[PDB]
Design a binder for this molecule. Structure first.
Ligand SMILES: O=C1O[C@H]2CN[C@@H]3CC[C@H]([C@H]2C3)N1Cc1ccccc1
Length: 282
């Protein structure tokens, strides 16, 4: 079926939970043996969210190459994404090592450091120009260059230096700051505006490594971001945009990381975002 009228048909019939449970039942199951090794316990935020072995990002280190991060490679859309958990106190150096080694231009953050009165990720970037951060375990330096605070999101320019080679690179930090502590946004308008700002920066384009996108677990809000982006790109590429099937795209993405889209409300919000976005594109 088309999307907008399939949408109204699920609303009128109140069957979002049944649709979402079908997706959970059909989703791929692949091994995640490296994630579960005892030496990696303090590298995982949640015991039930792990990268598959076949798609995990490897650190360029011989001691321990493990990070909780996955490469989502979308063949028809010609887009790739790295989805990862919010960094932990003992993985902030690994996180920036990955950004460096994978040649990423942009980092997309969809959570606040504290939500619901608890810490959802480490403070992993500097908040003042004159107070830079050094990660001694991976030999990197990170400096805040500029910050632009808007009503729904903040964009930061950062300098990442590999202290071993003295090479430097400019990284863009796109921080969506207004996702509610509970539920999903009422309108997709600010989320879509944010997606378009990430696109306009070049961070999603083939001349760079894959964008790094995270929330707390790296599957819910993060899944909504890449699902909406890929569906909108396919609607622009194909002769028949009504052929784009958001459930099929989501199942394709779940071949590369488990659990993408965590609730039926996130699934409905993803439909809403793609529907409204397709009208603005034209
Ligand atoms: O829904 C939108 O809100 C607009 C505000 N105005 C800009 C033009 C594109 C717009 C957004 C930025 N879109 C559609 C869209 C959004 C993301 C990706 C692909 C298409």
């Amino acid at each position: 079926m088309e999307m907008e009228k399939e949408f109204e048909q699920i609303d009128k019939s109140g069957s979002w939970a049944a649709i979402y449970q079908d997706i959970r039942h059909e989703a791929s199951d692949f091994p995640s043996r490296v994630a579960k090794l005892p030496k990696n316990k303090n590298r995982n935020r949640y015991r039930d969210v792990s990268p598959f072995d076949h798609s995990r990002i490897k650190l360029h280190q011989e001691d321990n190459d493990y990070i909780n991060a996955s490469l989502i490679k979308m063949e028809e859309a010609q887009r790739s994404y790295i989805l990862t958990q919010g960094p932990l106190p003992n993985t902030v150096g690994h996180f920036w090592e990955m950004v460096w080694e994978q040649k990423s231009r942009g980092v997309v953050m969809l959570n606040r450091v504290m939500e619901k009165g608890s810490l959802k990720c480490a403070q992993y970037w500097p908040q003042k120009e004159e107070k830079e951060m050094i990660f001694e375990d991976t030999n990197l330096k990170l400096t805040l260059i500029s910050e632009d605070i808007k009503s729904y999101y903040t964009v930061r320019q950062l300098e990442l230096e590999n202290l071993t080679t003295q090479e430097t690179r400019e990284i863009l930090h796109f921080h969506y700051t207004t996702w509610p502590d509970f539920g999903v946004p009422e309108s997709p308008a600010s989320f879509l505006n944010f997606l378009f700002k990430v696109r306009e920066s070049g961070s999603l384009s083939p001349e760079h490594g894959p964008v790094v996108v995270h929330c707390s677990a790296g599957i819910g809000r993060s899944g909504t971001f890449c699902l909406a982006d890929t569906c909108l790109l396919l609607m622009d590429k194909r002769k028949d945009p009504s052929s784009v099937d958001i459930k099929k795209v989501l199942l394709e993405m779940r071949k590369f990381r488990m659990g993408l889209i965590q609730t039926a409300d996130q699934l409905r919000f993803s439909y809403l975002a793609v529907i409204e976005g397709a009208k603005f594109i034209m």
